[PDB]
Design a protein around this ligand. Structure first.
Ligand code: GLN
Ligand code: GLN
Ligand code: GLN
Ligand code: MG
Ligand code: MG
Ligand code: MG
Ligand code: MG
Ligand code: MG
Lengths: 5, 443, 443, 5, 232, 5
């Protein structure tokens, strides 16, 4: 879902 | 049909390939691939390979979804840098649902759907020629990119010269060997910036060639101890990198944009396409420029477009009409950058042009008075409007426009917005060394 | 009248001062000063010193303008760190036009004008207590600030301890020696973050004390090999620095915000002030947070305010009502940061409160349901609205609001807008290392 | 006018 | 004495104090603005409560004389090659022959103070100039203006930097010399400045400055190598 | 006469 942050 | 299954099997047997990279492109434009031995090639040609389709969604993937890997036979290319322990070949693949239906979230399938709509309206093909520009940086001792350019060249200058190096020459030679139609290659305005031009092919073939060109350029630059980057604006105060698109629409008779009896030797179809492209430019600016750094390139004084206007000869217009006519009649969009996904950009541009043709919109008069001369207020009175200044404003414009949503599809639109809003927030909350050098001792 | 001319002359003679720093504050909040020998002191007390008033405009100054330097006798302070070759004293000065009229572009004169308006409406004084927070960083070998904090403390923790160091203790001791009314001092949530509280004085005196406190803290921190910074958000992922303002309005009878018979023991004047403060918060957010780094602090999860709402007990409300009553009744605004100009912030806040009182606006009901629980859409239905997310949006809100313009004055408003727009343009076109780390290798 | 720039 | 003392004290604290008009490029230069006032038996000769701008006719004649011969004594007030590097637009140094009470870098500025403090400020002088020669030539120009009773041009307050050179050359606005050689030519043309300098000083100053200009002209600077060594 | 040169 969101590993960038 | 350029190749058949038997041709592919014969090629695999004769060139002694042991690895095949079934590759595709996700929403964010990153080239991804599944690697299979040659022994599975037959199964690959039977459209029976399963993989996780959620990877197409990028990092915003949630649930694993099984999807097929329909390959394209005409995209068979054998890489030359494979040593002798078996060669490596690739084929761009289509993504299909388990119910034998193309996946709506695949950019290539979306582009195919838009092309089907265009053919339904009466046209035959959408020829595209891209003009990608890239920067070359010297690597460090640990093979890490640095901020030092490979040469201090100039626009069309004979800077790399002979006697070794000249990475542009080696790149174009290997591209020609691999089977690429290269028109020309030259040094760009910025030091260490180079441009290589392609021949005009179909939309899908042009996008595939763009992806392969990026991959090959990066690999060859890494070979010679260099880093090739397609960032829109790697450095401040220097010219950015663009991917100008020269598009032409064809029909049964020939070029649909050419009319010897029309004004500027342009057909009414070309004017409708211009009107559609200019009307929705604020809409698809997000798709054509999807990174935060992209809008750092869209600043005045570096020949990048900043206002929604078209001209035949002007300092940085949004849309430019090249002087060539006949079968070479085309419209050039200059706001696209190399970081954009070619399939999504082509889909949205084709949708905008098709909407303009269907609505028969009248384009605004061309501007040739150096719009940069006046202030924002003095030009806002006329039809000149500013492009979005940040990714967030572009995302808002996307969320407002409906035709671009229809051209992208619900799945792609939702996943694109989600990923780009995360990117915006990530950049918004960060603390940059600029602030720790402007307000540290000051405040 | 605390001091007279004869008192100043006697002090200068007895303490053996040879240098006087006639200081003032520009639009941007930077403390500036003209340095004169003691032999000129008499002339300084005659309001005959001329200087360049354009420096008040900051870097956006164009034309040199001569202006007088009316000093304030009550602000006479002798610095202790002056060795023996003559001492140094300062007096905050007012700026006057050559026609014996106070300069409209001086923040202190603007605050005096707003206070005159408040007195015209019927009130006596505007008491203010600030809560400034600052960070301490270790210096390098070349006496340059680093990113390493002085201690890994906690909220109200006894982290610095005894046995040397404890820069907070030395700072508060020297502030007490210099003649500062310090209520308390403690360690903040972030490591290396400290807060020192003041006593409640008049608006002008509080702003002067804020400026002197910043100067003294920076000097003393530099003495002990440390860098004291008031940047709203020096580091990412860590608590920011705030300058919460506790304001109270007084009349002839006493505190105007206190009423034993009113709801929450608050007078109708207090509710009108709350309504005015909340109505125009989107307007003066730019003035209270004038830097780009400021809006990096206004993010959820770090106790900084993010929504326009008031409460008596809530997680990060924009306006908080302390439980203390009687003569200590006050309203706390938490959106202010140490980087703001105290005079401009007080002027705009007083103008907003005065407008609310004059219009007799009804404040919205307080929220205590953890507004962070719902999404933006689920709370936009009620009166909860978001603060501006960037300095550009705050500047737009300033350019829209008229009451804040009236409270700032035309000169200050125009110069502030010009400087802040230049700052925003400078930040927008820069290329940060974040962008390279995110796209140099991917694209 | 513009020392910052 | 101030120059000597400042240099000595700066050397004491391990520093170098320089009065070079423009030590660095792209940064503000150093100036030595002169605020001059003329006195008589009654008092300040530049002050008149009944005159326009509270200025006497003597002050206006002095302004006319100072502006008429500015192109003449620019060489004396800016005697070094580095001096004309300071006289460039955008750094508050004067570049055009005009006077104003409030403008962005005027050649002559009239401070708002009046009474015994009435004065005229010349901003083209730099610290490198000889104070005695500069005062002599300025006094000679003002005295000639008073004797001839010249009428000064109208003050300019419209940001002369806005227009181009041609658009402002139509009016009385003229450019200061752009190099020391042109200033030397202007000196050799003007006669009143020669009379104010004297034959001996004029001849020796001209000889030294021509030697300086010739020495600078024939030198090869690293700028030239950085611009042409690789290109050509 | 010419020590500079
Ligand atoms: N000479 C040119 O047109 C280069 C344009 C510029 N490199 C861009 O990215 O837009
Ligand atoms: N504990 C607190 O209230 C600190 C608040 C936080 N430091 C701010 O800047 O708002
Ligand atoms: N602020 C000023 O007026 C400085 C002027 C500039 N330093 C000069 O040499 O003329
Ligand atoms: Mg190009
Ligand atoms: Mg082009
Ligand atoms: Mg606190
Ligand atoms: Mg508080
Ligand atoms: Mg001056």
């Amino acid at each position: 879902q969101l590993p960038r942050f | 049909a350029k190749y058949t299954k038997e041709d592919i099997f014969r090629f695999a047997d004769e060139q002694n390939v042991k690895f095949i990279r079934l590759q595709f492109t996700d929403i964010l434009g990153i080239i991804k691939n599944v690697e299979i031995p040659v022994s599975q090639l037959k199964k690959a040609l039977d459209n029976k390979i399963m993989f996780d389709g959620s990877s197409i969604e990028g990092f915003v993937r949630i649930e694993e979804s099984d999807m097929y890997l329909f390959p394209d036979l005409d995209t068979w290319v054998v890489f030359p840098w494979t040593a002798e322990k078996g060669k490596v070949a690739r084929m761009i693949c289509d993504i299909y649902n388990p119910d034998m239906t193309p996946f709506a979230g695949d950019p290539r399938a979306n582009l195919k759907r838009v092309l089907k709509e265009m053919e339904e309206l009466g046209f035959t093909e959408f020829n595209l020629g891209p003009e990608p520009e890239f920067f070359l940086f010297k690597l460090d001792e640990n093979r890490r990119p640095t901020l030092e350019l490979n040469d201090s060249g100039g626009y069309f200058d004979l800077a790399p010269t002979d006697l070794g190096e000249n990475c542009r020459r080696d790149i174009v030679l290997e591209l020609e060997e691999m089977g690429f139609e290269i028109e020309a290659s030259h040094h760009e305005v910025a030091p260490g910036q180079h441009e290589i031009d392609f021949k005009y092919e179909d939309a899908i073939t042009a996008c595939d060639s763009i992806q392969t060109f990026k991959l090959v350029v990066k690999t060859i630059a890494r070979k010679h101890g260099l880093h090739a980057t397609f960032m829109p604006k790697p450095l401040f105060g220097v010219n950015g990198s663009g991917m100008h698109f020269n598009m032409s629409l064809f029909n049964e008779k020939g070029n649909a944009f050419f009319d010897e009896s029309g004004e500027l030797e342009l057909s009414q179809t070309a004017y409708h396409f211009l009107a559609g492209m200019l009307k929705h430019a604020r809409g698809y600016t997000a798709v054509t420029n999807p990174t935060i750094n992209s809008f750092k390139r869209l600043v005045p004084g570096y020949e990048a477009p900043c206002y929604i206007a078209w001209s035949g000869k002007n300092r940085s217009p949004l849309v430019r009409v090249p002087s060539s006519r006949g079968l070479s009649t085309r419209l050039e969009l200059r706001s696209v950058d190399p970081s954009a996904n070619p399939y999504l950009a082509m889909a949205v541009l084709l949708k905008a042009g098709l909407s303009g043709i269907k609505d028969e919109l009248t384009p605004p008069a061309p501007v040739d008075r150096n719009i940069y001369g006046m202030n924002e207020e003095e030009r806002e009175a006329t039809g000149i409007y500013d492009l979005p200044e940040s990714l967030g404003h572009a995302l808002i414009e996307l969320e407002k426009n409906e035709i671009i949503k229809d051209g992208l599809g619900e799945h792609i639109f939702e996943h694109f917005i989600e990923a780009k809003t995360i990117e915006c927030d990530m950049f918004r909350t960060a603390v940059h060394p600029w602030e720790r050098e402007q307000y540290l001792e000051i405040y």
